[PDB]
Symmetry: C2
Subunit: 548 residues, 2 copies
């Protein structure tokens, strides 16, 4: 199998991970000094949030120069040196190719807003790089994604005197992909970084490339054609590199971003369908949704691989769930109106689960058992907290907490002088939660994560095997098998907060002796009926092999 099927991804922001020069802002030298950490955690691949020059009105997803490194973060030679030292430690590295849009402050748009004609008479090449309208009347059949800041997907530019289109901030005008000169430019943006050694791209907001009147302007076929073109390029010109879709849609729509095998698109897609159901199942102590949503996922092509994740740098999205489910999830997980944003909840993993470690562990054993490659949001392995006094999703992006010293080890600058301020509240602050402490605690959450990644690493079934739900007879107990090679694993997870009993249907496994993946603790051999009784305490997870 390909390398990315086996990997554990780890998602960090250069700017909030480690500061190297005391300016209060994370940078590449700082990241480079921390690399042994990620090596020894069990991480295989760094996913870096955007590092490009940018005015940071969406924290770097408003790219202003696809071919550089933001001054805050180091120089291009810094990047080159970090990329060298990552590969010297067996870490693959992938970027963010922000394809749908650029900053208002990108040269292309500053040039596009001059008009169709230049003041001499000749055409303005760059005007048609972007999406203009004289009235802004087009595409009304579309939803606004940033509901808490934007009123229209059309904004009037003062200079061009007409309306430009954007699915996100008006800082971030949409690029016009019916212009093949623009498709050129981002093949060329990709080649620039692929030639430097980068192993792949998270591609940003792929469902929103092409708009069309009288459609939802999401997931359209021509969008997939643009994306097949990217895969065609990378397969020919840089074999073995990764393409990783951020497609946040319903499951029938998400499987499309893989593509047939005769004409492929991405290699991997995030499993946005299950992420909200993991949390919902917890509060309801009912796993039905998990199995039904895993149910609506087709078989995917040979080269395909899901990226399973719990949280990340954006809010917990709720835009692809039922009106009912969404209401439930706010009631269970956003008690304060301050916790809500944009059809979503902006909290880090540990506070969503009340800092209860039995629950955090439970959800992480599922992340690593469900089929795919698991990606970890930085700091979620020491149990970091949110800071909601910060605006718009910055609250979950606070600086990494390395030790109990100045700014938690993030900078020698004072927390006031940090890009976002290091958390110091009595529960989740760097005085209580930091890596130093958990390296010297025999029992810490950092240690526990590393151990389960070893344990996952020691059974290739978890990364490569099939999935089959077995029926338990009690919706608080979710159970499934994963088979690959001789291995057949059995994973039983109790989503309720008191003891539960189930009656696992294991008729296909009569004769087999289940034992524990930690020290092969023996269980009764499955016999006759196939119907196996089990009892489980609070949030327990049995990880088991079915000999022979």
């Amino acid at each position: 199998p390909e390398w990315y099927k086996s990997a554990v991804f780890y998602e960090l922001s250069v700017r909030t991970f480690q500061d190297g020069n005391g300016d209060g802002k994370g940078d590449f030298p700082g990241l480079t000094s921390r690399l042994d950490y990620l090596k020894n955690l069990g991480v295989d691949c760094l996913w870096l949030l955007p590092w490009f020059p940018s005015p940071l009105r969406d924290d770097g997803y408003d790219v202003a120069d696809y071919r550089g490194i933001h001054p805050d973060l180091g120089t291009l030679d810094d990047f080159k040196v970090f990329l060298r030292e990552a590969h010297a430690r067996g870490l693959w590295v992938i970027g963010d190719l922000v394809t749908n849009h650029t900053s208002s402050d990108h040269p292309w748009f500053q040039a596009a807003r001059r008009g169709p004609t230049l003041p001499d008479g000749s055409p303005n090449e760059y005007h048609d790089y972007y999406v203009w309208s004289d009235e802004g009347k087009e595409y009304a059949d579309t939803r606004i994604i940033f509901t808490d800041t934007e009123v229209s997907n059309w904004t009037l530019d003062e200079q061009a005197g007409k309306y430009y289109w954007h699915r996100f901030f008006a800082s971030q005008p949409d690029l016009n992909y019916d212009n093949p000169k623009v498709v050129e430019e981002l093949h060329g943006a990709a080649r620039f970084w692929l030639d430097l050694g980068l192993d792949g791209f998270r591609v940003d907001a792929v469902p929103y490339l092409i708009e069309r009147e009288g459609t939802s302007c999401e997931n359209l076929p021509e969008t997939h054609e643009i994306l097949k073109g990217f895969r065609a390029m990378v397969d020919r010109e840089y074999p073995g590199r990764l393409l990783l879709a951020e497609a946040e849609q319903w499951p029938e729509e998400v499987v499309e971003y893989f593509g047939t095998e005769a004409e492929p698109e991405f290699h991997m897609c995030f499993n946005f369908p299950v992420m909200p159901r993991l949390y919902m199942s917890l509060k309801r102590e009912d796993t039905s949704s998990i199995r039904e949503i895993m149910g609506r996922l087709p078989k995917i092509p040979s080269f395909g691989q899901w990226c399973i994740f719990l949280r990340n740098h954006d809010e917990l999205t709720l835009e692809m769930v039922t009106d009912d489910e969404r209401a439930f999830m706010y009631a269970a997980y956003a008690p304060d109106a301050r916790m809500k944003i944009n059809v979503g909840i902006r909290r880090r993993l540990a506070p969503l689960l009340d800092n209860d470690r039995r629950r955090i562990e439970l959800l992480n054993t599922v992340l690593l058992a469900l089929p795919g490659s698991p990606v970890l949001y930085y700091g979620d392995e020491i149990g970091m907290g949110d800071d909601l006094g910060l605006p718009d999703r910055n609250g979950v992006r606070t600086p990494m907490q390395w030790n109990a010293g100045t700014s938690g080890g993030f900078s020698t600058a004072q927390p006031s002088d940090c890009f976002f301020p290091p958390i110091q509240d009595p529960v989740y602050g760097f005085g209580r939660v930091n890596v130093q402490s958990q390296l010297q605690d025999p029992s810490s959450l950092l240690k526990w994560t590393a151990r389960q990644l070893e344990l996952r690493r020691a059974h290739p079934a978890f990364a490569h095997g099939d999935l089959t739900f077995i029926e338990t007879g009690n919706p608080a107990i979710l159970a499934f098998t994963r088979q690959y090679d001789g291995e057949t694993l059995l994973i039983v997870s109790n989503f309720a907060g008191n003891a539960q009993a189930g009656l696992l249907d294991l008729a296909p496994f009569v004769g087999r002796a289940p034992v524990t993946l930690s020290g092969a603790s023996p269980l009764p051999v499955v016999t006759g009926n196939g119907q196996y009784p089990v009892v489980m305490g609070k949030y327990d997870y049995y990880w088991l092999r079915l000999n022979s």
Copy 2:
């Protein structure tokens, strides 16, 4: 039933709990301000460590005035107010009556070491308050209890020119209970405090009162008869008051300290027999030794109630276990030779269990479900650690950690200036393990202890009911029932570090459904055979009720 059969006890030392005036030493004004915390924790009786005038050569167990308050700790009026404020909250308060010995700085011993006759010529009333010998020959049978420090229980006195007896430090001369004027004085001391309102006493070192040649000078008949006289005193003059005994002996000799319904002695004794066997059971993953020592305990009288604990201000003592048993506790639990003191281990509960919460929760639920009244050591409810850089068991007595402020909130004094210096290492120090953090943390070990004493309080079978083990068919799992009034409880606990299976023998409960005490989750009904399949994760505890 009497109050002490229902109480939760909390052990603490006034000197290391709360400083009031920032002089570095804890004091009764500071303790009074924290009674809200103790009441809210669900504690019922405070047990205080000795608070008398003294030179603290054994943290005040070497007493130099029975009817004063050590000035480190306040005035006798500060003590009255504390006592008034504790009762005003429905809290009992018991003291420590050090009976066997007095400081060498006690007025008595200063007088007694002057000889059997004064200079003027009349007899010295005080000389016989202590046990003198001219040779040191006598009582050659006895063992030294402070094995690391004293070579001889006899010590020459420079001034009296003859040897004096001490079972503990040389600076703690033994009182002589063959003089009835000593029994007189300690009845009067005992009265002094009971007249002020104290709800009883822990009597210290009871086995070693009277010494007789040709015996071990422990547990003697004449030591019990002195003690029957104490019970008789409080029985008559102060009905209600608890007598409580520290008797660190094998089970048959421990049970003598209650002393039949005909002429009673103590209302309560520390269950020293089970404690080593709980720790040893956890590391063998084999609970047999817990059942064996509950068996060898004979039934105690009607007024009697065990005192169950895990840790306390002394070392985890091993003086009363096998050579093999002791070798296993030393190997499993004392990797540094330094952690050994006086046949036993000087470490706090959280270090002993590798700071592992699943394990701390395990033992504590066992503390709460075994018959007896449970006593908690101060700060093991937040998971405090130890400081081996202090001498002679003081490592487990560092100041309480209230918050992350100046000395963990124990004082405005710098930690260099505290009586003992607050713990500050990266795992257990007060920047990470403190009460502020855990009152604010939804899922803290403190909140856990409270929510888990409330469960205990909600079921009088825990306090009063019987005890019956059941057979589980797997020595890793420890099950018992407890029955009182309607209620039959069923407590199943896994002592292994990975999932275990067992077949519980529930034959006399067929037709009956076990249900969960938390959130009333019912399990499969016990049927036909009675043989109940169960599975259990890492250090699980099932607290169940049996309908109907």
